[PDB]
Structures are given as structure tokens and as C-alpha cells.
Design a protein around this ligand. Structure first.
Ligand SMILES: [Hg+2]
Ligand SMILES: [Hg+2]
Length: 179
């Protein structure tokens, strides 16, 4: 059923107050450093012995980005193999890429994103989400985003692999949808 990242996002949707969102937003430059009881509560109900500074950064970052959203797709998320890829940020980014005439600068910004280390990531992701949110119609699956960020430092780099494949798979798909 409901994975922990799903549960997390549901909880933010159901329980956040406007004050929480203000804090979540404010913490964007140093996620975790701006404490939000709501989030702390959720992390304090699992973490145990994973002083995982990463986890805390990822949760808080997703909170902040989510708390910043403007997408029409989030207005829907209040009512409600291939599925794998569409649900990843790679797919969202490709959609943005195609919306802007297959713009090489998005592709580059995207490659740069896949190169990020832990320190670079919160910043580059924040810029990309921002770009994505400029297009009205593109959904970002937050729970998948969080799961993916959590696994960023895995060894043969599966998330980054996964994203890349989603991106080029979507682009290719469009070159077929057109005839
Ligand atoms: Hg992160
Ligand atoms: Hg979601």
C-alpha cells in the first residue's frame, strides 16, 4: 500500500497550516535548518538510529518545494514499467524540454542536474522545479521525487540512470506521436 514517502506527502497535504508552509518555504536555502514541528514529528516517528543528514535534507527540501508549488496538477492531487518512468522527475523534465522546442539549454541544465553531488543537488533541483513550474500543465510526482532523492548516493547511480532513461524515453516517444 502506502509507502513512507507517499504517507509523508499525504500528511503535508492534510495537516500543514499556512504558518508551516511559510517555514517550509523559508528553509529552502538550508533544508532542515529551519525546523518545522510537523516535519520533525514525521521524521521522529521513523529515523531511530539513522542520523541520516541526507534524509533530513531530502524531506525538508521536498517539503519546501511542495510548499512552493503552483502547478495545476497539485490542485488535482487534492481530489485524487512505463508508469515507472512517467512518475520520475526525468519524465517531468522531458515534458518541459519538449514544451520549450526541445531547448538544448534545458537538456544541459538537466545533464548538470544528473551530475550534482549532495551539496550541489538541493540548489540545482530547486532551479529545475522552478523551471518545470513555469509550464502550467506538468505534474511533479512529489512522493516519487522524495524516494528518488533519498537514493541519490547509491553506488552505480540507479536514480540518475533511471531519470536519464525516462528523459530520453519520453523525447523518443514524442518523435513517434508526431506524423
Ligand atoms: Hg536531497
Ligand atoms: Hg504525489
Amino acid at each position: 500500500e502506502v509507502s513512507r514517502e507517499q504517507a509523508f506527502v499525504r500528511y503535508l497535504r492534510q495537516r500543514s497550516t499556512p504558518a508551516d508552509l511559510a517555514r517550509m518555504r523559508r528553509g529552502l536555502d538550508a533544508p532542515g535548518a529551519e525546523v518545522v514541528p510537523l516535519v520533525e514529528g514525521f521524521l521522529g516517528r521513523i529515523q531511530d538510529e539513522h542520523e541520516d543528514r541526507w534524509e533530513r535534507i531530502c524531506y525538508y527540501l521536498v517539503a519546501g518545494l511542495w510548499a512552493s508549488t503552483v502547478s495545476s496538477s497539485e490542485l488535482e492531487q487534492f481530489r485524487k514499467v512505463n508508469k515507472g518512468y512517467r512518475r520520475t522527475l526525468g519524465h517531468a523534465i522531458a515534458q518541459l524540454y519538449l514544451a520549450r522546442d526541445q531547448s538544448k539549454s534545458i537538456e544541459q541544465r538537466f545533464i548538470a542536474l544528473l551530475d550534482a553531488d549532495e551539496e550541489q543537488l538541493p540548489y540545482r533541483l530547486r532551479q529545475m522545479v522552478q523551471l518545470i513550474e513555469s509550464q502550467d500543465d506538468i505534474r511533479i510526482y512529489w512522493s516519487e521525487l522524495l524516494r528518488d532523492l533519498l537514493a541519490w548516493n547509491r553506488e552505480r547511480k540507479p536514480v540518475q540512470q533511471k531519470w536519464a532513461r525516462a528523459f530520453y524515453r519520453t523525447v523518443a516517444k514524442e518523435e513517434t506521436i508526431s506524423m
